Amino acid sequence: SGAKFRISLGLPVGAVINCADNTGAKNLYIISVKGIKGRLNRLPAAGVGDMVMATVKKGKPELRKKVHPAVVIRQRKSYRRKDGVFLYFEDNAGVIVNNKGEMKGSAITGPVAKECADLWPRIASNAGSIA
Amino acid sequence: EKTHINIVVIGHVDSGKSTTTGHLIYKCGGIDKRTIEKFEKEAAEMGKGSFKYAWVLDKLKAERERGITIDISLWKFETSKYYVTIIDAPGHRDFIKNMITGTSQADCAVLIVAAGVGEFEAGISKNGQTREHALLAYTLGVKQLIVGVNKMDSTEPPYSQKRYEEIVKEVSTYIKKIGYNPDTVAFVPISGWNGDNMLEPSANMPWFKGWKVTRKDGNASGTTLLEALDCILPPTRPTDKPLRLPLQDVYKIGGIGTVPVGRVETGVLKPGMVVTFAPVNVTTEVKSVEMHHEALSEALPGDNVGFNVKNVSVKDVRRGNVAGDSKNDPPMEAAGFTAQVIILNHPGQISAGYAPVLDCHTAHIACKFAELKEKIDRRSGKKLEDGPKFLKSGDAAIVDMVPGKPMCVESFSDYPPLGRFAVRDMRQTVAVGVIKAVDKK
Amino acid sequence: FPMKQGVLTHGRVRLLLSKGHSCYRPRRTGERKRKSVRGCIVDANLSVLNLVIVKKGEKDIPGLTDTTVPRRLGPKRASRIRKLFNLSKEDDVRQYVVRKPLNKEGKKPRTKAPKIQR
RNA sequence: UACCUGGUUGAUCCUGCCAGUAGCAUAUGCUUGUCUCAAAGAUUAAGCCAUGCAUGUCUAAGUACGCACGGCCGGUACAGUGAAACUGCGAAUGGCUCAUUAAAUCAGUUAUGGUUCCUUUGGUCGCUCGCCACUUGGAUAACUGUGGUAAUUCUAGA
RNA sequence: GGUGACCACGGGUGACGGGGAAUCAGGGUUCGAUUCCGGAGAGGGAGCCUGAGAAACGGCUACCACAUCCAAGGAAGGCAGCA
RNA sequence: AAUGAGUCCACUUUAAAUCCUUUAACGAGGAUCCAUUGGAGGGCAAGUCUGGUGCCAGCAGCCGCGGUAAUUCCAGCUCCAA
RNA sequence: CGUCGCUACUACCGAUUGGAUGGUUUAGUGAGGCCCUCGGAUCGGCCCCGCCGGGGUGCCCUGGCGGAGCGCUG
RNA sequence: GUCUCCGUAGUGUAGCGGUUAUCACGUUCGCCUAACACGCGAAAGGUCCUCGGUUCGAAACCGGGCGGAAACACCA
Ligand SMILES: [Mg+2]
Ligand SMILES: [Mg+2]
Ligand SMILES: [Mg+2]
Ligand SMILES: [Mg+2]
Ligand SMILES: [Mg+2]
Ligand SMILES: [Mg+2]
Ligand SMILES: [Mg+2]
Ligand SMILES: [Mg+2]
Ligand SMILES: [Mg+2]
Ligand SMILES: [Mg+2]
């Protein structure tokens, strides 16, 4: 299989990031990161490919008062890709998914990180382009 | 040229039905190499690598996620002798009605039996399905079948002779009770995932010489499963009888409309001919006739054809109806029909009032006993007793039945495939019934 | 995708091709259509690379320079025959036209002569 | 065909509305023997469309060395039948719908002495003083051959 | 400067306009998407080549919304034409 | 005694058909070869008929009917208008 | 006749800097076409002219290789 | 087709592997009234959607099929 390597995190709790799908939401306010144990005073942060719990702050009204599982697909923080390549995107973006991993939406706007596509095949299936 | 048949593959869960069927399709010119390369690419993407050949028929997303067979699928592959379309049974007791529907539209049955340790014994149990599939195929009217043996590369040691001899003996010693002759039923050891003994004679298992069959109509002996698929005797097609179409599924294709797909039983279906449906009783006119991405000016019996009728919605006509010619005598709503249920395995007593699920041809509606007329012994319709209070396992009986949900049925004297039906209760098999009388409205 | 002279890149670009440029024939008059063409610079990322040798080398390539197939049909414009066979002024022009001989199994032998113009 | 009737009251005259009555024009219900005309996806969605067809075209009078046929009359540029293609024309007509549109479109009336106009028809085409004219130059089609792509009414080279 | 209670300007229209249709003492009152005339449009806008004549869409280009194939490198759309 | 609605020969028609008009031969005594849709208190033509239900079911555009002898409900017969 | 109490229906006010769906526009960004000013990947003519050539008689009517005039040009 | 929840006198529906009950009704009902109206009294009323398995026996412990109520997919 293959386990995702460590990358620069860059997106702590409280970061609001773009919505990259056709769900109707416009942004995702990260409230926590899945699989984070913790440390005193340390904010839980997430790179690309990480499942997060997010609440949409603006968008279609029947999504705003809920917590959704979400996956970060693009980030503005540079991260090393174990081949010497430092990659960063133009914006931080994520998609709305469920626990199993398939997206609530049906299409994705813009590229998706290679790590996120590898770790979530259902997101990669809807991916317009791979970065 | 060529003639048309239908084949169902039946067996135990996790034995690799869809995998072996799909790799048989691939060997017989099913689809090009790069599309199935993309299929294996997907299979490696999410994880189910060994489930790659299953995707050729298990196209549903729920099947593609759980790795569990759900729906009956069709795929066309041309063989050495004649055309054949294959039925892929689910193999689950939650989907037993789906298997019954699929096996109904099949002329031959393929009884794939696992040879690996554990799976074979788990198949042969009260919790098993190998008994269930064969018994209900014998109930629904499939005469000639084949028993296939799979997973010679999973057993220890692989490609064993004693293992296969035990398999054949243990299949025979109960399929004689079921009703299929091992002298006519061929026995093949195969392995779909490895791809041996299917298209070319095997080299990893030289101990297998070749199966032999001894039928009255024809004697055959081959080495590959194609050589056994092709030697299947051509069924007698009763084309003079009035047209009947036990419907499989309904589809709403954009641009052509709601096109039913159902097996032709009797008669000939043609473009430009008004047809009727028994359960929905709405008249409609056939526009065209096609099968398996190819067209037909005539539809022959035992064929999976897709014909476009005019001005009926997808919701109006649903799964399991009966269609026929409007000019000839039509199938009509049956208020009651006198059936001959032969009780096989029922713990409790069967009095008038208990409601099992009765499955005439395709669909599935629970029906209720009205009263039990006479007790009949196990063969020939020999009279024993009048009006028993209750029925018990090991006895045949003639019964008058009153279904609750509306349905149409036909007798075993006019359309023999329509006369075959089963009775199911307590999540097992409880009776074998045939229709010999029927009342219309 | 065929290559076009003058693109000055290695890679595929899209051009609104007009009448008589390259890599395009108009379906109707005045029609222009955007098409994908490959740059004029050649590199590894090619399937075929057309080459035309200019000057003759020291020896003969087998199957290439030998068995010189003739051009099928001769000149049709009268001045072109005049230039080909060095005609001064009206010297047996009717009989200097190339008579094409053709035959078949069922065909009785026959020559063919064009309708010379100008 | 310039028309009324029932309903407020114990009863009477009114005001007044409600209900009744008749036509057409959509839908629908019941029924249906013949025949002649004949509307028919406008009303909600100018919403979405698989598939097939709906725009092509040659006279004697533009260009034929396709054998794809063929008379040869046999010493001849081209008999002739005609594919394909170049060229010219049409494809801006027709058919469909009524979304937009409130001096806008449109209707009657007037003007272009404020403009253009393929084609048809009729004028004009020796009106000019100025080493091929017994006819000049080059290329491209169709055609042979070599291919690329998974493709397409895609095209490259020679 | 120009237009306005002789209703300008603005808004709504379940408005394409007319020839016309329905009702029929007279006067009127409703209806005209619909075969004739004129106009507009080709999913929504926009910009163009050819041609005497097009801002053409059973022509082209771009964006947008949908949407066909794929060997994932690409390619092709417009039934408010007859079905 | 006479006709068709239907079967159906041929013709006609028509691009070719179809239909209609002609024309052979069958085709009527419940001529069962069966006309229906709404009504019968008023307006508004037609029953103070019979049997049921009994302010229930229901009818009724509107006045109104129905709580055990219903001109109005449901049925049967008979009438009414087209 | 009106309050009050109960049951239904209809609108009304109403915090929520409520929400959704259309239309018209400010500003910013701005594909694409068209026009102009450049640009010159290529394709051609003349000066060809190292010359063998040449005819009225080195003084060429030019029939081809060939450099290239390393220019003028379309 | 996959997934989630709900369904129990006619309704309002508590519910416990040892008991489907009560209560507001709705109705009927002696009880009066010419008929009401209003007051006095009793009741009936449940396959726990439905059918199975576990269990000494289960509505309920578990699972199926049906109806509803939300999704999610579903293109010969
Ligand atoms: Mg702290
Ligand atoms: Mg000429
Ligand atoms: Mg009649
Ligand atoms: Mg309008
Ligand atoms: Mg109009
Ligand atoms: Mg018009
Ligand atoms: Mg237009
Ligand atoms: Mg012109
Ligand atoms: Mg346009
Ligand atoms: Mg009456």
UniProtKB/Swiss-Prot annotation, chain A:
Write the record's keywords in alphabetical order, separated by commas: Cytoplasm, Phosphoprotein, Ribonucleoprotein, Ribosomal protein
Q: Which Gene3D superfamilies match?
A: Ribosomal protein L14
Q: Which SMART domains match?
A: Ribosomal_L14
UniProt entry tagged with the keyword Magnesium: no
In the record, what terms sit under GO molecular function?
A: large ribosomal subunit rRNA binding; RNA binding; structural constituent of ribosome; transcription coactivator binding; ubiquitin ligase inhibitor activity; ubiquitin protein ligase binding
Q: Where in the cell is it found?
A: Cytoplasm
> Which InterPro entries has this protein been placed in?
Ribosomal_uL14 (IPR000218), Ribosomal_uL14_CS (IPR019972), Ribosomal_uL14_sf (IPR036853)
Question: Superkingdom, according to UniProt?
Answer: Eukaryota
Location, primary (coarse class): cytoplasm
Annotated family: Belongs to the universal ribosomal protein uL14 family.
Q: What is this protein called?
A: Large ribosomal subunit protein uL14
Q: Which organism is it from?
A: Homo sapiens
Q: Identify the gene encoding this protein.
A: RPL23
From Swiss-Prot, chain B:
Q: What residue spans carry the region label G2?
A: 67-71
* Chain positions with Phosphoserine modification: S297
Residues annotated for GTP binding in this entry: 11-18, 150-153, 191-193
Q: Which UniProt keywords apply?
A: Acetylation, Cell membrane, Cytoplasm, Elongation factor, GTP-binding, Host-virus interaction, Hydrolase, Isopeptide bond, Membrane, Methylation, Nucleotide-binding, Nucleus, Phosphoprotein, Protein biosynthesis, Transcription, Transcription regulation, Ubl conjugation
Q: Which residues carry this modification: Phosphothreonine?
A: T429
What happens on changing A396V?
Resistant to inhibition by plitidepsin and ternatin-4. No effect on SARS-CoV-2 proteins translation
N6,N6-dimethyllysine: residues carrying this PTM? K33, K52, K162
Q: Please list where the region (G3) is annotated.
A: 88-91
Q: Which residues carry this modification: N6-succinyllysine?
A: K389
Spans annotated as G1: 11-18
Catalytic activity of the protein: GTP + H2O = GDP + phosphate + H(+)
Q: Which residues form a coiled coil?
A: none
Q: Which GO terms describe its biological process?
A: cellular response to epidermal growth factor stimulus; positive regulation by host of viral genome replication; regulation of chaperone-mediated autophagy; translation; translational elongation
Q: Name one GO cellular component term.
A: nucleus
Q: Where found?
A: Cytoplasm; Nucleus; Nucleus, Nucleolus; Cell membrane
Induction per the UniProt record: By homocysteine (HC), may mediate accelerated synthesis of free thiol-containing proteins in response to HC-induced oxidative stress.
E.C. number(s) listed in UniProt: 3.6.5.-
Residue numbers of N6-acetyllysine PTMs: K162, K169, K270, K389, K436
Domain tr-type G, first and last residues per copy: 2-239
N6,N6,N6-trimethyllysine found at = K33, K76, K162, K315
> Mind telling me which Gene3D superfamilies this protein's record contains?
P-loop containing nucleotide triphosphate hydrolases (3.40.50.300), Translation factors (2.40.30.10)
Whether Lyase counts among this entry's keywords is no
Q: How does it assemble?
A: Found in a nuclear export complex with XPO5, EEF1A1, Ran and aminoacylated tRNA. Interacts with PARP1. Interacts with KARS1. May interact with ERGIC2. Interacts with IFIT1 (via TPR repeats 4-7). Interacts with DLC1, facilitating distribution to the membrane periphery and ruffles upon growth factor stimulation. Interacts with ZPR1; the interaction occurs in a epidermal growth factor (EGF)-dependent manner. Interacts with PPP1R16B. Interacts with SPHK1 and SPHK2; both interactions increase SPHK1 and SPHK2 kinase activity. Interacts with guanyl-nucleotide exchange factor EEF1B2.
Q: What is this protein called?
A: Elongation factor 1-alpha 1
Gene behind this protein = EEF1A1
From Swiss-Prot, chain C:
- What keywords tag this UniProt record? Acetylation, ADP-ribosylation, Cytoplasm, Hydroxylation, Isopeptide bond, Nucleus, Phosphoprotein, Ribonucleoprotein, Ribosomal protein, Ubl conjugation
Q: Which residues carry this modification: (3R)-3-hydroxyarginine?
A: R77
PTMs per UniProt: Ribosomal protein S6 is the major substrate of protein kinases in eukaryote ribosomes. The phosphorylation is stimulated by growth factors, tumor promoting agents, and mitogens. It is dephosphorylated at growth arrest.
The UniProt record lists the keyword Ribonucleoprotein = yes
The molecular function terms in GO held by this entry are: mRNA binding; protein kinase binding; RNA binding; structural constituent of ribosome
Cell location: Cytoplasm; Nucleus, Nucleolus
Any one annotated GO CC term: small-subunit processome
Q: Does the keyword Acyltransferase apply?
A: no
What broad class describes the main subcellular location of this protein?
Answer: cytoplasm
Record GO biological process? cellular response to ethanol; cytoplasmic translation; glucose homeostasis; negative regulation of bicellular tight junction assembly; positive regulation of apoptotic process; positive regulation of cell population proliferation; response to insulin; ribosomal small subunit assembly
**Function field:** Component of the 40S small ribosomal subunit. Plays an important role in controlling cell growth and proliferation through the selective translation of particular classes of mRNA. Part of the small subunit (SSU) processome, first precursor of the small eukaryotic ribosomal subunit.
> This chain belongs to which protein, by name?
Small ribosomal subunit protein eS6
Give the species.
Answer: Homo sapiens
